[PDB]
Structure formats: C-alpha cells, structure tokens
Design a protein around this ligand. Sequence first.
Ligand code: JJ6
Ligand code: MG
Ligand code: ZN
Length: 313
Amino acid sequence: GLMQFTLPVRLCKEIELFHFDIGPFENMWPGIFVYMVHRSCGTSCFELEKLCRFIMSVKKNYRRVPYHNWKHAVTVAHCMYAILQNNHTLFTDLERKGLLIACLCHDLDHRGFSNSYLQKFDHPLAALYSTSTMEQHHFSQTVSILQLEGHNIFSTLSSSEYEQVLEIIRKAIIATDLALYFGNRKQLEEMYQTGSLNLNNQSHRDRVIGLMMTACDLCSVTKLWPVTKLTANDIYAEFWAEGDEMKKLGIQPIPMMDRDKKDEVPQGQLGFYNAVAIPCYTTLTQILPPTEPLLKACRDNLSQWEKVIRGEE
Ligand SMILES: OCc1ccn2nc(-c3ccccc3)nc2c1
Ligand SMILES: [Mg+2]
Ligand SMILES: [Zn+2]
C-alpha cells in the first residue's frame, strides 16, 4: 500500500518528458511501467501483486523480434503516460487505467509481419480476422492474459466499469491498425475545423483516443535523432525480412520492404513523415495543445532525414 516505485534522479526527471528513452536495461522496464501507472492513475488503481503478475505475463508473450518487441510495448506506454500527465483533467479514471494497459498490450505476440503478409501467406489469423488481423489477435491475447488465475488487475471494478474498460482497450488496440488511421484523422480534422468536435460525445472521444494510440505507437519518430535513427534500423530489419518472405511466395515486395533498395529509405522516411507522422501530431496538437513537443520533435527528425538525402549525413 505505502510501497512507491522511485527511479534514479535522471530518470525521475526525464520520464516526464515526451522524448524519454527507457534505456537498454530490460530489468528496469517493469518498474518504469508501474511507476507510470502509480503517478498517472494512483497507487490504489491495481493490486501490485496482480499488476506485477500481469506485466511479467505480457512481457513473456512479446517475441524476440527486432522492433515489435517488449521495448516497443513499454516505449508506447511511456508516450501515453506523457500525454495523460500533460492533459490531467481531460481523461476519466477508467480511461487512465485502460489506456496504459492498452499501450502495453497493443502488439502482444507480434511476429514482425504486416496484415498484408498474413493475407498473402494465407495465415490462419487472416481467416479468423479479415481486417485489422494482428490487432484483433493483440486484443484476443490481452483478454487471454487477463483471465489467467491471479492476473485480473480489473477485479475491483464493477461489472459495468469492467465492460467499459475492456471496450476502451479493444477500440484503442484496433486503432493501432495504421490502415484505419487515415480516415480517423481526416474525420478529426473536419470536426475540429467546422467546430463540431465534442469531447462529451463518446464517438468523438473514441476517435481522439484512436489518434492518441497512433501518436504513441509512432512515438519513436519523436525522440532525439540518435534514438530515432537507430530505431529506424530495427523497424527496417522487420520490413526487409517480410520482403524476403514475399520473394519466397514469388511476390516482388514494395520497395520499402526490399533490402536490395536500401538507397530509397531516406526518401521513404520523408513520405512517411509527410503522409503519416506530421499530420498525426498536427491534429493531436490542435485537439490537445500540451502535446506540441511531439509535433516539434517530429519536425526536427523530418529535417534530419532531409539532411541524410542532401548527403550532409
Ligand atoms: O525511426 C523510427 C520509426 C518508427 C516507426 N516507423 N514506422 C515507419 C513506417 C511505417 C510504415 C511505412 C513506412 C515507414 N517508419 C518508422 C520509423
Ligand atoms: Mg501493431
Ligand atoms: Zn506498435
């Protein structure tokens, strides 16, 4: 009850910042997450015995893939913590609980392959879930872990609060499907500009939480350049492996996934920042002004990719 997690001074201070990197010490990541739950939600939100057992089972069900791994889970949860802490009064007790767990669980059992590769392979998960294939799997895996004996961190919620929190987590995890992001942001753009955006409208909150999830999910483009640049290697190691596996099905992959076309990556990163990342953090900044540091860091990293192309690095 009276047992806080306390981080070393440099982490205690930097963890409050959007651009915080959780570091290379894996054994510190569970404590970093509990710390964030305690400050974001409260020390009463979860039974520490159950939370700790939930965290370690979530960890175990992330695979040793280059990018979509346990470190990504905790990184995405930290970005959400930073958004919730800079927007104190906009989010309910249930939403603060649901969203940190949602981010931690959002890529459970990822194999490092896209929804497209599952469909072209004809993977069983592509027959069980026709759209947002991996994301429905990620939510499925979250529910499984919640139902392990001693793992139900939500046991103290009423029946109706329990249903609301699982519904928040489900929508949050589905929203991490980048194919759904484009239409969600376009709708949020219209609503903000015509002035119809209303945070008491549940369908509107849903969309705003969706954008937050995309923002947290892409947060590696909002770090200091060296973090962003070295994380890019990890994401491309998965892309190129998927490209290799496309060639083994006798399908030439898109150039982004073809390790024979590494030269095209700087230009492909520009397209990604311009088409996806910058618009995402722009709309998020309009809806939640205190999240402007994410947009600023993202523009700084666009400029750094522009310098790569111009041969300045
Ligand atoms: O630097 C870290 C980083 C983080 C996330 N993503 N996601 C992409 C991406 C996703 C789809 C298409 C193209 C690029 N690139 C990056 C780079
Ligand atoms: Mg995902
Ligand atoms: Zn993710």
